[PDB]
Design an enzyme around this catalytic site. Structure first.
Site: not given
Ligand SMILES: [Co+2]
Ligand SMILES: [Co+2]
Ligand SMILES: [Co+2]
Ligand SMILES: [Co+2]
Ligand SMILES: [Mg+2]
Ligand SMILES: [Mg+2]
Ligand SMILES: [Mg+2]
Ligand SMILES: [Mg+2]
Lengths: 386, 385, 385, 386
Positions: D53, D56, D87, D180, D182, D216, D219, D244, D256, D286
């Protein structure tokens, strides 16, 4: 290999391999199975015995002559094959008379009938050599809040169970009761929905020593709970009287998949726990071969329950025997978990400065638990990749 | 539907004090002075507050700072007339508790956990609290070999029996309430439901000292029926305290204001507590959503109490309605309260009407009249009668 | 809150006709003559009924018996003025469909499924139905190698494109609605949610012919927010029909009467359909619990319509309240309806107020005022304003 | 053995191994991890690349000099190690300004800021060579019904996405977007809760060819859905742009777990599907090493994600290659599922008496599907017990 033999103590409900595949949206896809054919073919697969609801063995409404004829034919099949009957239960859910419950039906006349039906089958269970009598209160519950006063229903449930314990005690029978929790289905919410609620309820019976639990893998998972953890609490309590093994893929309707299907990692940890604990009960399968299967797919499914148990047992045994795993267990302080916190007693604890003023919380916080490496060794052993 | 202190509504300091920090997001409100929490809740018509040790005194405070913080909170209680019915220990936030507290694998941590709890029990007694809550949020595991659950139950029993010895030896009038939770923050938490906590209590050395503190959202995170679970705790004589809030389904622990989430379950819960005449505090353990500013925090708190009062009125009206009483008799709720076999086992075995002459088809044809009863309940809840 | 045919309430023949047989229990009511269903629903103020082919004509009937059954149903429709807005095919009860119908692994079964559907489409048109529903209850799997889902989607697309060719070639004015369901009776069903069905439609040869028929309980069995899912179907222009009922949590498909289960979701659903001005039938797909006798079956059906009407009144009052409108502006719902960047991409990139001079801390301090807005909604639902 | 190498294309988010262990009830248990140390140690473990991100990599609020210094240091670590960045994504959920959403915040000023923050990171993503830009709308949603008009929020979401597609198109960038889904957490309900809703939404964008999904594992499982089935629909649509990988043990908060933990059978079928389909995207993890772990437990967890993928790939490959499995697949008619139902066309179908009047439904109903034996072969291969 992974060939089952009667020494493994695998058992099946007659209604499992006998399930005709009728579901709420579909008709039956298989013909009715003769209980004698079930006994014969399960013995051929290496089973140790079978279990039954009264109505799986005797047709509902049978005269006494028919009841005796059915029981006699069944016993001839057990005796020819050497199969046992470790457990029995009553069908208090199929007939429309039980649509509001059996022991906790609002109508007192139905509650009385439910007790008489159960008592007649306890006698039959003793005759066949069953040592555990299971109660699954699947119609005990409600779809709406005013339809069932839960306090009064627990009074009725306690009354029913006390009367059954008095019956067994007055007859001198060597049989014990095992309550099977389930959180919902077919009622919106079922009373005693989990291992916990059932164990708590037992502690309020007149003769609590006569009652334990019969937990089913899929039932606990229907509430998203950890089945090995629940089983550990039943074991810790001394109340694991019987078990129902199967699989469940999530929070949804009760699937009764063959054991090992569903949450495979949970099945491994369940086998590891039963074997490590030295639990000696029957490894009993309460599953439904899917309605997509013909009779050969039924026997494949049944064989697969036993095969999966034996593979998982081999892998869990190899996990516990591996000195690299035992070293990882000590690195994660599993040994300390089994040590008393304060065998020195409360007064010594309260005097001990290392437990408070001198306890270095920051040094203790810095220690890793090393659980991931330990779990990866467990995954490697389960997958045969050590 | 204005609350007053006669309603005995209470709030955790950490509820209105929640700064809005979640696992994905930073705090959205500044820290709330516990004294200001007490005055504002009092203005709202609350009866009392509850606290973790670390909500009142900064973790690590010297004995002087501790006394100064305590004295200052007490003056705010005395000024407003607010009470403190319940206290609990924070055994979950600090990293030392990452593997648990009473069930940490590390023995030193289990001993430190017990010392930390005992210090706070002493404060709880000083402050007037009658219930001490234990919420084992970090007792549990994410993986199967990490925790031997049989040994963990031995450590949990040992810790609770030591606490019981402590309270008895000091002559304290205080009882323990265990708060179940199925998961979060651990993958699975020990004693995950009301039933597991009730069963565990029965094996303690002094079981009379221990009850449950069930939370609405916690039972609903396992898809369970909260009013049924509370009914079993009341039938057992173990409902020592309650956490009221809302939850919308099986998902993370939302702690919505009471009334939100499962609204029909909230109606039945209120009917049950009222009908049973349960006299404990109506305590809210909820989190004002992090979208809210400080005025929204007080709106959320007022809403908890308002919802309870409206539900109370609708439940009482339901029970008082002669049409509802008739519908209850039509559904045979009166018979559910009658003994199945007062005549005893031998007389039941001899009674042909209970077996050979029981007309099962006639009985099966009888409707339960539950849908009409439930629609009356719905009409009452919605004020549509 | 008395329903009338102006409300356009409809019921499946199989709802009030459910005999109460479940996976653990036999039928508790006798079979209901479809003609009697029509007259009784009409008396209750319903507007119409819906049917599977096999609800009207016994599976296997000769052409003569089929005509006689159809004619007899039609006379009851004409006598009462009831309509038939929607029809569907039973592709799930008979054992031949145990591995699916349009996605059965066996090609002969997929061809037979299509022939069975086409016969019924012809009847649906004869009877006046404008929507043909497909509920793929047996399309799915219990195990991972049993169904190649990519190939199954190819067969499903092929079946639906063949149906579309059929309706177009005959010149029928009828549209298809796909009903999602996440599981039950299969371990996992294909197109398990509103979104998966919407996405699948976009890849059919004639996507304009196909919409969704979402059912409240089905989305809630996956823990999803049914009003949000309906909002996406409305935004897409694909809400061709709806099944109203109730569900209490993630568990088996309960099909409770509408209003039961998630009562706040039912309020928001009604607010959405009303606010959007959606004009489809308000169709109930519910099962009167097997505890009920025939009078309880009609109580349950009346309750569906009554709940809808009370919820309608409370939602309209919520929206009409000047205090609620003020609270909506306080929460900036009006801004959510304004374009983010009508000025366009280049102007947004040049706008310092959207980046270098955007005061993020000032913005972060703004409360959303959602709790007060939601408590007004609660007050309106409960008639406590 | 099961040693990962960069040819396997395994990737990790910086925030995965960098997770400090702060949860909603607990403080951080590990110190902040330097992104350069993450790149170095993941390269040592056999990873192919990392993802990020914006926040980060660059501290929120950094001057341009700090932004350039951070990016330059990061690129030196990539270049030394040969690690890639396939990515990138934007953090539109941590800061309190996004507490009501980013692209769908009710406040228009926040929506505009959210777009500018994202656009600046698209530029950075192109500079680093990322080919996919992920959007995870984790604050897009609501806890109450009146707080969000979902139709208007989808209008705003479509507007945001269209403006991003116009940006990429006007710049000539070779980057594609991956949404993505969720279902909930941290909002009560999140918009585009599943693979399905996200794929449907894409079909209404101006330039739908620029958008796919980044599903993911955990998710989809948070909604109790079958993740391999969802992935098959994304593949069928041509929209699987990135993935993910992780684990999830049920319907509960977003765990996760490392990949292979959670629903192990689902992980096997997911690997079987990605490999069988020939999907060539990065195998991106992830996950969050549990807060119980120290830094060594972090690297064990990361290594375990890759190891589990490679074991599962070996087992799924052995399953598909086994002629006993292929014979079981034909016995279950998987080959027929891949044949057109009616390549003869509608008119021929409608004329064909074998499809209706002459179709023997009772003979067809009698055929078993032989799915249980086929599933047991799959279980034997997964467990290394053939
Ligand atoms: Co079951
Ligand atoms: Co909570
Ligand atoms: Co349904
Ligand atoms: Co996640
Ligand atoms: Mg069972
Ligand atoms: Mg609480
Ligand atoms: Mg439906
Ligand atoms: Mg992700």
């Amino acid at each position: 290999n992974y060939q089952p033999t009667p020494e493994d103590r695998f058992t099946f409900g007659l209604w499992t391999v006998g399930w005709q595949g009728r579901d709420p949206f579909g008709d039956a896809t298989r013909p009715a199975l003769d209980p004698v054919e079930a006994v014969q073919r399960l013995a051929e697969l290496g089973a140790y015995g079978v279990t039954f609801h009264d109505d799986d063995l005797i047709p509902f409404g049978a005269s006494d002559t028919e009841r005796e004829a059915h029981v006699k034919r069944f016993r001839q099949a057990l005796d020819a094959t050497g199969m046992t009957v470790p457990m029995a239960t009553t069908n208090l859910f199929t007939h429309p008379v039980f649509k509001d419950g059996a022991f906790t039906a609002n109508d007192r006349d139905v509650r009385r009938y439910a007790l008489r039906k159960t008592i007649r089958n306890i006698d039959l269970a003793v005759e066949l050599g069953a040592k555990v009598y299971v109660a699954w209160g699947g119609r005990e519950g409600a779809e709406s809040g005013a339809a069932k006063d839960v306090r009064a229903a627990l009074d009725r449930m306690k009354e029913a169970f006390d009367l059954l314990g008095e019956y067994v005690t007055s007859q001198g029978y060597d049989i014990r009761f095992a309550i099977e929790p389930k959180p919902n289905e077919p009622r919106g919410d079922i009373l005693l929905p989990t291992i916990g609620h059932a164990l708590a309820f037992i502690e309020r019976l007149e003769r609590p020593e006569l009652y334990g639990v019969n937990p089913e893998v899929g039932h606990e998972q229907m509430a998203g709970l950890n089945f090995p953890h629940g089983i550990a609490q039943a074991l810790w309590a001394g109340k694991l009287f019987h078990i129902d093994l199967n699989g469940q893929s999530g929070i949804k309707y009760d699937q009764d998949l063959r054991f090992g299907a569903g949450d495979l990692r949970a099945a491994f940890w369940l086998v590891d726990l039963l074997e490590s604990a030295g639990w000696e009960g029957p490894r009993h399968f309460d599953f439904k071969p899917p309605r997509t299967e013909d009779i050969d797919g039924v026997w494949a499914s049944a064989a697969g329950c036993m095969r999966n148990y034996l593979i998982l047992k081999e892998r869990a045994a190899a996990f516990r025997a591996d000195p690299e795993v035992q070293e990882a267990l000590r690195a994660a302080r599993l040994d300390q978990l089994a040590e008393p916190t304060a065998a020195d007693g409360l007064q010594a604890l309260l005097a001990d400065r290392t437990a408070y003023e001198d306890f270095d919380v920051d040094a203790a916080a810095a220690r890793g638990m090393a659980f991931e490496r330990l779990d990866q060794l467990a995954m490697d052993h389960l997958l045969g990749a050590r």
